[PDB]
Amino acid sequence: GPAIGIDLGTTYSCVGVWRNDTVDIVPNDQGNRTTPSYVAFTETERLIGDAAKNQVARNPENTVFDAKRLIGRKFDDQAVQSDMTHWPFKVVRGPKDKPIISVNYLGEKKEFHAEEISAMVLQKMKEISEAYLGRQIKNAVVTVPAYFNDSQRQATKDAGAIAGLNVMRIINEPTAAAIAYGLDKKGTGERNVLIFDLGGGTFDVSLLTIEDGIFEVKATAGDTHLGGEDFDNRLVEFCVQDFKRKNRGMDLTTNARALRRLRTQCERAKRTLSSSTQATIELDSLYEGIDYSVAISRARFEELCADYFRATLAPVEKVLKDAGMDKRSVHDVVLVGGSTRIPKVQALIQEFFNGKEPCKAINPDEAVAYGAAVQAAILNG
Template sequence: MQQKNQVAMNPENTVFDAKRLIGRRYEDEKIQSDLKHWPFKVVNDGEKPKIQVQYKGEVKRFAPEEISSMVLTKMKQTAEAFLGTSVQDAVITVPAYFNDSQRQATKDAGAIAGINVLRIINEPTAAALAYGLDKGLKGERTVLIFDLGGGTFDVSILTIDEGSLFQVKATAGDTHLGGEDFDNRLVNYFSEEFKRK
């Protein structure tokens, strides 16, 4: 909620959607398409996107990995406060469609946050684990995991064995099919309607 209040008062310095930038090149067509929706500035720094903000009167530039590391640092602190002990290791989830570059950039974000990243796993696989789809299983089961989020859409088909062995059979997704994209399309549609009238 704090971010939503911040974006209204200081939009050009409120950063979000680092997941859409991480592990991509500045000239990537998806980044170029997203630029028109972001109130913050994204600049080309050696073919890599950097988020530029004003902080205490200074211009600062952050790589998407640095922004993600800030989120991971906060999550680490929250986990440590809840558990009452330090957290060194973590498994981090990423959208199923993330390529190798995006996965490596996510690992780098974990390292920047001081986390030993044990593994990167697909979000739909994590959902299957979280819902205990492997519990009380007799034989093998094939499941479809459908994840429509705020900014992404993931679908995975998994087979789960009674020994809690997960095997990903197929995966697909879209970085630009989620709640935020629905909002953007509605805004574009209604702005065109108002222009016509």
């Protein structure tokens, strides 16, 4: 039957399908083409995607996310132990050193492996595709980070099987993005491709070489805790200090609701500032019946996050340095990840590459799913 490509992302997931001999990226029921990689369990239901993410504050112990940071890893891994201190859900050690997520669900304690959480997300991507295409779907390519090891790959395949998918192949995220732009069929001889992938919570840079249409991952670098959320945090912080300055030292972070509402509008302000030079936050009855409003300029946003945005160019230097390649030798710079929409981030990268135009014609948070789907179709016939 038909085959699909799924980007199983750390914070968002995305699915591509084949209609009329081209690739369609599938909207979810919110009209969005990316679905949060969130699941939640209550006494009467389980929620996936936006619904799960939206109720996190009301049910934080049973709202699971970041499963991609556990999948295929061991419980006493240092990264795992570090991440566990920032998650409100419980993780305990299963037999054979396997992490187990423990939550409450339908009135009982329930245990899940990370691949079981990821299977739910994959099942959602499968369902929305089935509605979109009007048929049952089994065959899929699923993407993973280039640095994922054999155990992380197999656990991703298992998440596939658990969701009822026949995973024809697990391919690398940066390669899928390269495939989406046809880069393996563009020009003569050897082609050097840099993938710059800045998301909600992770940053990955990958340097690939293509020859005779064959992909080799030459070098990877990045930061697994830099992305869009950190930029949101900086906007929040600014607003908190502005509010004190206006209201005799009153701190808004003391109230939870005021923070959620503020964090919600900061995210929206950040998005708005990718296409406008000004954004407004205005929230009635924010803290102590105190109303709050502020005008935030793009320049101010760029200023609050200046260190972060400069820090994204260091992994670009590391992959090039590690591969013994000059930045001049890169033929395609590909922007992937929703945070690449930030004009300043695009300007920094373009400046680093001496004014070269990036490949950005495909939505950067859809490029991976797109390439996955091309590959699914090739493997499918």
